[PDB]
Copies of this chain bind each other. A is one copy, B any other.
Amino acid sequence: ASRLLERLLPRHDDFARRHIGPGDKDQREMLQTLGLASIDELIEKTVPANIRLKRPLKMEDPVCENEILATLHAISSKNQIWRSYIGMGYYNCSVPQTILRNLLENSGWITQYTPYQPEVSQGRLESLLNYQTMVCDITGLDMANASLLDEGTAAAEALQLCYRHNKRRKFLVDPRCHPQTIAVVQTRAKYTGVLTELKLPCEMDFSGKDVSGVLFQYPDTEGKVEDFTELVERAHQSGSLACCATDLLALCILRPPGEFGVDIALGSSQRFGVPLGYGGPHAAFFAVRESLVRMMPGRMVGVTRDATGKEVYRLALQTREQHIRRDKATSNICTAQALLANMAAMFAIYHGSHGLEHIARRVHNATLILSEGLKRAGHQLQHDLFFDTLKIQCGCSVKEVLGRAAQRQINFRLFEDGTLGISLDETVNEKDLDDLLWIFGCESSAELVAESMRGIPGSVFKRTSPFLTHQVFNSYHSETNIVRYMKKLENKDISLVHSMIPLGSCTMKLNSSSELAPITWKEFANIHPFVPLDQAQGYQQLFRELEKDLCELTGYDQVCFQPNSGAQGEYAGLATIRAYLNQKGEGHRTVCLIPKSAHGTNPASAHMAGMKIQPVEVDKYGNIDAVHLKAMVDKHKENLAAIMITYPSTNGVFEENISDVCDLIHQHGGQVYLDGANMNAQVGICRPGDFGSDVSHLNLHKTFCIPHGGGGPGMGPIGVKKHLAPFLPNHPVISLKRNEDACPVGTVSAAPWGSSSILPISWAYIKMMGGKGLKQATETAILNANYMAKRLETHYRILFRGARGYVGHEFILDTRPFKKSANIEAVDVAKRLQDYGFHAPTMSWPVAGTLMVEPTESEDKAELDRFCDAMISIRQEIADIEEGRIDPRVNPLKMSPHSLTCVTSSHWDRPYSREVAAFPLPFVKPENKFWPTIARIDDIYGDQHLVCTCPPM
């Protein structure tokens, strides 16, 4: 039926053929291994017939890769790049081009995920330790984590930490915090049942000994630098904690929160060399007094020792986190902002304390200069002491000032009260100051104003304490040196530039160059999140197009982009459910059913959304236990708010009767939350919204190619049925309401569409793949997983399978029996894989002592076979131990991983060869050998001796 032109002149390229690893020959061969005639037969045997799409996805014709950037350009060029001096927690900066090119645009940095396998991850672990050290030095607090999502969520994590600490149900918020910070804090509080009160310090009453904590900002949203010593002391005297939202650049010249008693310091690291990104991504910072560390949210790098006593790095105190403690975790956060934390660390390293002081002094002096010019022109400054931010009462019409501002394409903050906020930044030069003085009708140039001329250096607030005294911040100031340091860390880390990283529950698929290109385009990267919307019409088109596509892939009616991780999506989803229930008079329903199979974020998110969790058991086949489910529905039917189902579940299987589960919950007055993170098994085949789900978040960083970034960034947009739409998150600065019916749950992220600048990645993937491609991707994800399962099934037990014996896109290998037979544990297999040139699969989750394997469609048959051959070779190593052919204490498995130092040493007293140690199979060649950089990590020692900043060189 094709036009003749299409026969003579076919498509230039099909991106699916670049994205999807196995071609026709690979797929036939894998199907032959499975004893199947076709892909359709596989799908038919895997995905329940009754949930499958009736018609193919309705998508636009696929866009050739050689046109995708021009296509996207026609959108991005509709944005306008003004000079934004809005402030409000986002400040333009001069992103060092060397960090941008050698880290952000380097696949050796961005394709790896969370550093669960430390011995092949020491580079990003070191960098994240650098980040923590930097945060602790500058804030003056004892320990910092390895990033939070944004400023607002960090402030909410502070509120919740206070609750966890002293269990008081009142939290005081200074109204001079940024508005979006207040909104996110108020939302978190609302659904956790804590009362917030907006009170100036002088209005705050702690005497009731009923205040969990207080949040204030320094400098505050108006720009003012204030002494909070007395406030903090009053808080402490009544058993309350003190939380300070702050600014790393300001703290380069301001005495920090640590020196005035603050228990928690937090903010955004964005202006340390990361783009505005029209809201993100940015790594937020969070630091606390050592006595609070046990309650820390998120990841934290710690120093430990390896097997030989060498000083090395690992994620510390991991039992705090969602994947261990589930609803009892310190937070729901999983994916964070690792890559951007590392960008900010490299910024601090490149500049040192001396360079950062120089930048900060310059910004402050530019602000002082403008300040004097405006006063001479008859305008009033509301605050005399400030860092980079003025609050101005215009001596003339505000309209006339903004008219001139518009003429020079400059944005200010417009306060409610008719005054203007101006926040200067690293990028502000003489020319900009002259424009600004002209805007305010100051006849005097910047040069002239400077002539007649204090601030922070002349004040009691002058910083007198050192920071970044560690060698790491004093060694890499030449561009040659920073490039070498970045490369050194990169080369310590196994990533998708080396080999398949088959992490179950992570979807480590291709992050394509064409998808990634636009995220550093200025029209995406260099827009302030809070500009007037007529400057971001390109973004608006992007959002509409991606929304429409995601709606079609999922069967939902509306998408909300605000949630900036999967866990945030779950939290937003549940909150929307509760707002829906409240609105319709059913607010008493707070019970959330959660299968024990569901991802750990699910119960943590339900706890964060103030729900009562009822676990639901899973049966022996790996499915939701139908008997228990029916019993828990019956038990809770009066109070039932929701179920959270992961589908297919974390056990790797499709439940045969998921519609029936959805019907049962609906019949008893509850809503269905479906965790969409496993949509890599669904896209183009079935849709959660078709089979009875009400709301689902998606992991754009899993299914839709946003890079794993060493542990972030992510995006967790939620798709909802239209009955939930009126209750979707909005934002106090930029309005997200679609209807007059709107009844927003609140605000879950600091920026209205979260990390907007990385959405182009998923838009590009979707537009290049089209309907046919996206389907093929899912088909091949399922094929690849089942092929691997088939190859391995006689060597390892496949723990769970679907009703006809097939898995989804991932499966579990039950390594548990080897404990009794050979004293071999999952960890031994995981470390030994490193010697075979592979990052382990997901280790000891969701079932202790097992491995969860997810190849993705992006890896080809040869690569799958290398991995299966490694596992089969390892099985034979286990059999050697089982059958007494090798020492059961000293063997490759127990001694893994084998470092370069180990294998090149003059001393060799192992009962196996150096070749068995390091080159166990012929595909592991000296010319492609990736070395674990350290011997086996000591997990216990690190937690018993907690060191979470850079140790002396």
Contacts and interface: CB of A to CB of B under 8 A. Distances in A.
Interface of A: 3-5, 7-10, 12-13, 17-21, 23, 65-67, 69, 94, 96-98, 100-102, 105-108, 122, 358-359, 362, 365-366, 368-369, 426-427, 429-430, 433, 446-447, 450-451, 453, 477-481, 483-484, 487-488, 491-492, 496-499, 510, 512-514, 516-517, 858-860, 863, 899-901, 903-906, 913-915, 918-919, 926-929, 931, 933-934
Q: Is the interface of A mostly helix, strand, loop or mixed?
A: helix
Contacts of A447: 3-5
Chain B CB count within 10 A is highest, among A18, A100, A366, for: A18
Contact of A453 (B8, B20, B366, B430): B8
Chain B CB count within 10 A is highest, among A427, A479, A901, A905, for: A479
A21 B450 contact: no
Given A20-B478, A496-B480, A101 B105 contact: yes
A305 to B, nearest CB: 15
Contact of A18 (B3, B102, B478, B913): B478
Given A4-B450, A858-B480, A97 B69 contact: yes
Nearest to A917: B904
6 contacts: A4-B451, A12-B359, A20-B478, A97-B513, A906-B913, A927-B933
A453 B4 contact: yes
A487 B498 CA distance: 8
B450 A8 contact: yes
Contacts of A927: 122, 488, 492, 900, 933-934
A903 to B, nearest CB: 5
A105 B105 CA distance: 9
A365 B122 CA distance: 53
Contacts of A928: 488
A9 B101 contact: no
Per assembly, the copies of the chain total: 2
B901 A480 contact: no
A359 B13 CA distance: 9
Contacts of A7: 450
B8 A107 contact: no
A447 B512 CA distance: 32
A370 to B, nearest CB: 11
A640 to B, nearest CB: 45
Contact of A904 (B21, B477, B903): B903
Nearest to A23: B477
Contacts of A98: 512-514
Contacts of A450: 3-5, 7-9
A861 to B, nearest CB: 11
Contacts of A430: 5, 9
A39 B571 CA distance: 63
Nearest to A491: B491
Contact of A101 (B18, B122, B517): B517
Contacts of A102: 107, 513
Nearest to A482: B18
Contacts of A17: 477
Nearest to A931: B926
Contacts of A903: 904
B4 A513 contact: no
A854 B904 CA distance: 33
A858 B478 contact: yes
Chain B CB count within 10 A is highest, among A106, A368, A919, for: A106
B484 A498 contact: yes
A931 B925 CA distance: 13
B933 A904 contact: no
B480 A859 contact: yes
Nearest to A516: B101
Chain B CB count within 10 A is highest, among A5, A859, A933, for: A5
A101 B497 CA distance: 13
B97 A517 contact: yes
A483 B13 CA distance: 18
A12 B426 contact: yes
A914 B858 CA distance: 40
A451 B358 CA distance: 68
B479 A19 contact: yes
Contacts of A906: 913-915
Nearest to A99: B513
Given A12-B426, A900-B927, 8 more contacts: A8-B450, A108-B487, A480-B496, A480-B859, A899-B926, A900-B929, A906-B913, A926-B933
B9 A365 contact: yes
A560 to B, nearest CB: 31
Nearest to A22: B478
A8 B369 contact: yes
A368 B8 contact: yes
Nearest to A919: B904
Contacts of A5: 369, 430, 446-447, 450-451
Contacts of A12: 94, 359, 362, 426, 429
A860 B484 CA distance: 12
